[PDB]
Amino acid sequence: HKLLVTPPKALLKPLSIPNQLLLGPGPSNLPPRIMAAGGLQMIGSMSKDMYQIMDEIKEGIQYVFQTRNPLTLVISGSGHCALEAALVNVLEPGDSFLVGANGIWGQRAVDIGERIGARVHPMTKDPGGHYTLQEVEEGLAQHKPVLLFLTHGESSTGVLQPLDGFGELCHRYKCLLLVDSVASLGGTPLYMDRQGIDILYSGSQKALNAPPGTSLISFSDKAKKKMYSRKTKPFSFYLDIKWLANFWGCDDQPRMYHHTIPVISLYSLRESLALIAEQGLENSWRQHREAAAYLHGRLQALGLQLFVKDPALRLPTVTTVAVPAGYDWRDIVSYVMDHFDIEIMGGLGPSTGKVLRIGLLGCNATRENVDRVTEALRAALVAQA
Amino acid sequence: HKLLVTPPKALLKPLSIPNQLLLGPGPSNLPPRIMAAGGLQMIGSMSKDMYQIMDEIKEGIQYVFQTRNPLTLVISGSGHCALEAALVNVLEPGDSFLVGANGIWGQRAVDIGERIGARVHPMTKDPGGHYTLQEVEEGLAQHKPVLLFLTHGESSTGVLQPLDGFGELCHRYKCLLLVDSVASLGGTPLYMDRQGIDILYSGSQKALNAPPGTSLISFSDKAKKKMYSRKTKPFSFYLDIKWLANFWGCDDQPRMYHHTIPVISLYSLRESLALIAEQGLENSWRQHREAAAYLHGRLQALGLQLFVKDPALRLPTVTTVAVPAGYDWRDIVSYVMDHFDIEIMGGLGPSTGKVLRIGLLGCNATRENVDRVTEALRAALVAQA
Ligand SMILES: *Cc1c(COP(=O)(O)O)cnc(C)c1O
Ligand SMILES: *Cc1c(COP(=O)(O)O)cnc(C)c1O
Numbered sequence: 204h205k206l207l208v209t210p211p212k213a214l215l216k217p218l219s220i221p222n223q224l225l226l227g228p229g230p231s232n233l234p235p236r237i238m239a240a241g242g243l244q245m246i247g248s249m250s251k252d253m254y255q256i257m258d259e260i261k262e263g264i265q266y267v268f269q270t271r272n273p274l275t276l277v278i279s280g281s282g283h284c285a286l287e288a289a290l291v292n293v294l295e296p297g298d299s300f301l302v303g304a305n306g307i308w309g310q311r312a313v314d315i316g317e318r319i320g321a322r323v324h325p326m327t328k329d330p331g332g333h334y335t336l337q338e339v340e341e342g343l344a345q346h347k348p349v350l351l352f353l354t355h356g357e358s359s360t361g362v363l364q365p366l367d368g369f370g371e372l373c374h375r376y377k378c379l380l381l382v383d384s385v386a387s388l389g390g391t392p393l394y395m396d397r398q399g400i401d402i403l404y405s406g407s408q409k410a411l412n413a414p415p416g417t418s419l420i421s422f423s424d425k426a427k428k429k430m431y432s433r434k435t436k437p438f439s440f441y442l443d444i445k446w447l448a449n450f451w452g453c454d455d456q457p458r459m460y461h462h463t464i465p466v467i468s469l470y471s472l473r474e475s476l477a478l479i480a481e482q483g484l485e486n487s488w489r490q491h492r493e494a495a496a497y498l499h500g501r502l503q504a505l506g507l508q509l510f511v512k513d514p515a516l517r518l519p520t521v522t523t524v525a526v527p528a529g530y531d532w533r534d535i536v537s538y539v540m541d542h543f544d545i546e547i548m549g550g551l552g553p554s555t556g557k558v559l560r561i562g563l564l565g566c567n568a569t570r571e572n573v574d575r576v577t578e579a580l581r582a583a584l585v586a587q588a
Numbered sequence: 589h590k591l592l593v594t595p596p597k598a599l600l601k602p603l604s605i606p607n608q609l610l611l612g613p614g615p616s617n618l619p620p621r622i623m624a625a626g627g628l629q630m631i632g633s634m635s636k637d638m639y640q641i642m643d644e645i646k647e648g649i650q651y652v653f654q655t656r657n658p659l660t661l662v663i664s665g666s667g668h669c670a671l672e673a674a675l676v677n678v679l680e681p682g683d684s685f686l687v688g689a690n691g692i693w694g695q696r697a698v699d700i701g702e703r704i705g706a707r708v709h710p711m712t713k714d715p716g717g718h719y720t721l722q723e724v725e726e727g728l729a730q731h732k733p734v735l736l737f738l739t740h741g742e743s744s745t746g747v748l749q750p751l752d753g754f755g756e757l758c759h760r761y762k763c764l765l766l767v768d769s770v771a772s773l774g775g776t777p778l779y780m781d782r783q784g785i786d787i788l789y790s791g792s793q794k795a796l797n798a799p800p801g802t803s804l805i806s807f808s809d810k811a812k813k814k815m816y817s818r819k820t821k822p823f824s825f826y827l828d829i830k831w832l833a834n835f836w837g838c839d840d841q842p843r844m845y846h847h848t849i850p851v852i853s854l855y856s857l858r859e860s861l862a863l864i865a866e867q868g869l870e871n872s873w874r875q876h877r878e879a880a881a882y883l884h885g886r887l888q889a890l891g892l893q894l895f896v897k898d899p900a901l902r903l904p905t906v907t908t909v910a911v912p913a914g915y916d917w918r919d920i921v922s923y924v925m926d927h928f929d930i931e932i933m934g935g936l937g938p939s940t941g942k943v944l945r946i947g948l949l950g951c952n953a954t955r956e957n958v959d960r961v962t963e964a965l966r967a968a969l970v971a972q973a
Contacts, residue, residue: 207654207781210865211647218641218858223631230848232630241852242627245618246608247931248800256603262596269592279801280665280826283847287826315825396592408848415633416664416801416850438823440700441665441672460936462668463615463793465801467626468853473603480595546632551845 223540226576227548228358228386228521230408230415231564233471236478237412240470248463256473257451257464263476264419267388267411267484268403270395275421276451277472278442279465282385282406285418287315288442289381289402292430293350296320301339301348301378305332306359307552308383312352319438324348330360330553331511331523336368343376349429350379356387358409359551361511361523361560363391370399379426385409385418389479389565390491390520401426407468410491410520412565413475417468478566487565494568495519498561501577505584510558520568523550523558530587532559538583545579608925611961612933613743613771613906615793615800616949618856621863622798625855633848641858642836642849648861649804652773652796652869653788655780660806661836662857663827664850667770667791670803672700673827674766674787677815678735681705686733686763688724690717692744692937693768697737704823709733715745715938716896716908721753728761734814735764741772743794744936746896746908746945748776755784764811770794770803774864774950775876775905786811792853795876795905797950798860802853863951872950879953880904883946886962890969895943905953908935908943912969917944920968928964 225232233241246252257277264275278285290312294300300321303309305328316323324346326338334353343351351373355364366382373380381402384393389410395403401423408415422430422444430444437443446461448454479487495517499509502524510523526532532549536559539545548560561576563569610617618626631637642662649660663670675697679685685706688694690713701708709731711723719738728736736758740749751767758765766787769778774795780788786808793800807815807829815829822828831846833839864872880902884894887909895908911917917934921944924930935943946961948954 206869207656207779208651210868211644211651211861213644214648214651214858214862214865218625218855218862220628220631220855221637222629223635225630225632227632230630230633230851238627238629240603242623243605244607244623245610245615245799246605247610247612248615250606250608250931252604252606256605259596259598263599266593266596266599271592280669281847281850284665284826287824291823311825318821318823318825394592406848414630414850414852415848416853436703438676438703439672440696440703441669462666463791463800465666465799465850465853466615467618467799467856468801468850470603470605471852473599477599477603480599483595484591546635 223544223546224575225546226562226572227546228560228562229564231412231562231567233412233414234478234566236474237471240474241414241467243467243470245466248466249460253466254452254458256469260469260473260476261451263480264421266480267476268395268421269393269397270421272421272423274427274448274453276447276453277469278418278420279462280418281415282418283311285404285420286312286383288420288444289404290315291319291437291439291442292444293379293402293426294319294321295433295435297322299324299346299348301342301346301351302326303334303353304328305334306330306354306357306554308354308357308359309352310552330557331362333362333364333516336372339369340372343373343378348378350381352381355382355384355393356391356518356520358386358518358521359554361518361521363516363518366398374399379429386518386520389487392488395421407472407475410565411475411479412567413472414468417465417472491519491563491568494563494570494573495522497570498522498563498573501573505577505581520562520564522561523554524561526558534587535559535583538586539579542582543579545576547576607929609930609957609960611947611957612931613945613947614949616797616947616952618799619797619863619951621859622856625859626799626852628852628855630851633851634845638851639837639843641854645854645858645861646836648865649806651865652861653780653806654782655806657806657808659812659833659838661832661838662854663803663805664847665803666800667803668696670789670805671697671768673805673829674789675700676704676822676824676827677829678764678787678811679704679706680818680820682707684709684731684733686727686731686736687711688719688738690719690745691715691739691742693739693742694737695937716747718747718749718901721757724754725757728758728763733763735766737766740767740769740778741776741903741905743771743903743906744939746903746906748901748903751783759784764814771903771905774872776903777873780806792857792860795950796860796864797952798857799853801850802857876904876948876953879948879955879958880907882955883907883948883958886958890966905947905949907946908939909946910943915972919972920944923968923971924964927967930961930964932961
């Protein structure tokens with residue numbers, strides 16, 4: 204008859220959150236305008252006003268990606284979900300899939316690729332490494348892939364992968380180019396159409412300063428053709444691009460219900476795109492470049508060594524710092540939080556144990572935050588020694 | 589250096605949202621506590637405080653589902669995503685999958701099951717219908733399925749599916765029972781462990797009144813055994829239950845990074861679970877029961893016919909009304925919004941073109957809202973006559 208479970212006592216207490224200055228690889232703190240959007244009332248998930256907001260967002264993604272691609276929309280899930288959406292739609296079982304495995308993101312692309320039946324060909328590199336035109340051309344020639352995955356901003360290694368020329372190279376081998384720009388978008392130069400990128404995705408919670416939970420994606424016509432001529436439906440319904448394209452107003456059919464979009468998250472994402480449209484892409488790139496240069500100079504002043512030696516290969520948004528020999532990286536991370544309420548991170552995937560990671564993301568990429576994190580790091584290094 | 593795309597003027601003006609009373613089948617309006625939570629600052633997505641909030645949310649789901657299942661968590665996606673996560677983990681290609689296709693939710697389960705290689709066996713019924721024990725047992729004996737899908741609250745048809753005895757019946761046939769309670773949860777009686785349900789899922793944006801974008805799921809040990817003994821990996825990484833289980837603290841291993849959870853959406857979901865824990869499940873059921881009964885009487889007074897004839901079979905949270913002959917249902921929906929700022933909906937799937945749908949969800953299930961939607965309908969009806 205009765206009730207097994209009683210009302211949880213923890214839930215009868217008010218929600219409270221600590222104040223944390225998030226200076227790791229993401230998510231980032233939210234500016235007032237984004238927080239305000241997140242506190243708004245609901246509207247209809249298929250209403251004319253919702254559709255107008257979705258249209259503005261689409262124009263915003265096209266601006267930040269620098270693309271005129273009609274097939275451009277928001278994925279209702281985190282950065283992983285956008286990657287998975289690209290892969291389950293583009294790749295059919297048996298398809299040759301070339302992957303830049305130079306950190307955790309390439310490792311994740313390999314995993315998803317394998318799960319959906321692709322024949323995966325990793326080009327494996329030690330963390331800190333990047334791919335040359337010559338290396339990719341070799342992979343293209345040897346493996347004849349339908350798709351190449353490359354990470355633009357390798358947030359696990361602090362590496363900025365050059366993108367010029369890779370798209371045209373892929374196209375000469377009849378291969379599509381997929382680029383992960385979750386950590387790079389808004390913080391470094393990126394020009395989707397100019398660079399011949401076929402699939403580009405990013406996430407909301409990095410330099411955009413929106414809450415985590417949504418991601419951005421765009422597909423060239425070459426990519427669309429592959430996704431719309433499959434012999435088999437994608438393994439996913441939730442991420443089926445034909446349904447999503449339709450609902451996001453990317454085709455000539457009336458929008459049909461697919462899934463309920465995250466209405467409130469889209470308010471916030473809209474405002475994040477408004478903030479960078481107001482700032483200007485190039486102005487944002489300059490902000491991050493300068494903030495990163497300031498950070499690097501101060502880190503080296505403390506006698507720390509940047510994990511990526513070539514300044515031209517350093518990702519401005521996420522800086523990897525080699526962990527000083529004899530020092531405990533966990534205790535540095537703990538000290539920084541316990542005494543300054545600042546979050547930084549260690550490594551991720553192959554960079555685990557090797558590095559500290561410091562993020563400079565959007566409105567949080569400031570000289571003041573650089574001073575705050577370097578003051579924290581200094582105190583942690585001293586208490587240790 | 590030539591930017592293809594200039595900043596979108598649409599984003600260079602303020603975000604504009606209308607004030608709408610949402611009395612369709614969801615999403616519903618947000619109460620003040622839930623809006624307030626949505627406006628908070630970020631914390632670290634893998635911080636101890638975030639983990640504590642996740643633990644409290646988990647206790648909340650165990651309360652609303654009435655289960656002690658350790659494998660209970662939030663899916664980082666809408667209601668569709670929770671359904672897909674259940675199917676992609678439980679079903680291997682070749683598995684027999686029996687489906688109660690008596691509305692759009694069963695049809696969606698067929699679609700997903702087909703995509704992931706299951707041998708799908710629909711028990712098809714006209715909209716308005718529900719399954720008896722005998723019908724299900726007949727399907728079980730015939731198709732010997734590993735899994736049965738049943739919709740609890742059929743929100744496309746207004747039907748409340750009986751659940752007593754179905755779990756016990758499935759287990760006798762060595763079949764797992766999966767139940768969609770997106771529309772029913774919090775609105776009508778439901779007891780996961782007591783009713784022998786193996787997989788139960790719901791959504792954030794129906795009776796809970798949280799923003800759409802997250803969903804709730806729980807798995808019995810029997811369901812766990814299947815997911816953890818399959819010889820093939822699920823087609824999805826983003827929805828892989830072994831990774832999600834671990835990050836959500838359901839394992840005996842330390843939490844490993846999988847994907848970034850939607851931190852802000854979780855503040856809101858936590859608060860929505862807190863509101864219903866304070867009210868009490870039985871009180872919530874009573875509230876919905878009463879509002880619905882009051883709604884049914886006022887609809888019939890206008891000369892309107894309830895689509896579901898048997899009151900015992902009516903879903904309190906979503907009421908289907910037959911479109912009255914002579915009238916344009918589209919114009920009724922439009923009139924109600926244009927003049928009264930209220931959203932109602934037409935049909936969905938097999939009920940498309942046949943019904944109007946009126947939702948009474950959580951704190952919005954009130955006599956006041958019934959009066960408002962009924963006055964709006966009355967004006968709409970008179971206007972067309
Ligand atoms: C709304 C609903 C769903 C789907 O939820 P989404 O969040 O729109 O994906 C599934 N089942 C039922 C019964 C629903 O009412
Ligand atoms: C953070 C990140 C991801 C994954 O994002 P999630 O939101 O955690 O799923 C993928 N790629 C890069 C480069 C990232 O920085």
